[PDB]
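hey team, just a heads up i'm posting the complex here instead of the shared drive bc the drive is being weird again. everything in one block, sequence lines first with there labels, then the predicted structure for the whole assembly after. its two chains so it's a bit long, scroll down
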Amino acid sequence: MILTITYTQPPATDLGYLLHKNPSRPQTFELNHGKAHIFYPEATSERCTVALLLDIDSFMSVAISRVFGTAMSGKCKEKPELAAIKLPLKAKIMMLPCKGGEEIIYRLFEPLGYKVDVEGYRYYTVSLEGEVRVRDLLNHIYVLIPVLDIDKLFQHGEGWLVDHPEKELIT
Amino acid sequence: MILTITYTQPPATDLGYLLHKNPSRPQTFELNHGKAHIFYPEATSERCTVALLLDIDSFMSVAISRVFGTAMSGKCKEKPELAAIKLPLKAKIMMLPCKGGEEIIYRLFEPLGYKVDVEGYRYYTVSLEGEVRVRDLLNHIYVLIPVLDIDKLFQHGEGWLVDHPEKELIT
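-- predicted structure starts here --
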């Protein structure tokens, strides 16, 4: 499956510092039973988009924490203010299998303040757009993706999970 | 290495028909000694971007002709006019190794009417933007990429190669 994240606040290339991954340097990570590729299809002052493509042979969550580890912690040494604030962000998850249909997807992400779009073909493409922190976009995806198929949930459920109408399903 | 192509003439999703690859369906191709992944990080009415990511273990040219075969022929059944005309296009080639430095890159692409940008790190990222046909963007990349590291050159050198200041280097 694939994850993209798009940010357009000029210098949109700041997403590079926030994710702690240089736009000019595509990279591959060897995982348990598969590869993760990361690159930025777009890295200008107007638009910046990161992609993380999973090649296999929960895995995304693993890939997300392996690749976007420091961003998850909430830290950005070079732009401490952008890490700290809600940014206008778009994210896309392509080829997400989900037994519970699209209704459970809306049910997990809408409560978090995301405008949510679901496209089916059974795999899904989910589009999210909101004003959230980097670390919270990543945390949500990291926690909810597996649910759609306790320390983790403790560390990454932080400051959103308590007020979640589906918090018990998630738990 | 990676190739992206971006098109923004609204219905920018027309790039999907031109490339004959559905934006909603990421796909993997098994090759001689590697994989090619294709997907569209962006597929809206305002912007459409295709990516082709090579995972190995000339290969790009192979991948390009395998994946974008029909677009190379110049045909688009659903938008015959867009295939026929010069479109405003941007393309990116990331992680291109090139012994001859950036000077040979400018030398191969600028004559074709591309605004060309080269970034080094030895691998290169080359950015191209011009008003060319789909089939000609693809042909140029398919022919010049190997040069930067006769039937082919005959079929794909068509209607650009004769007037090329470096046509003999290419040949």
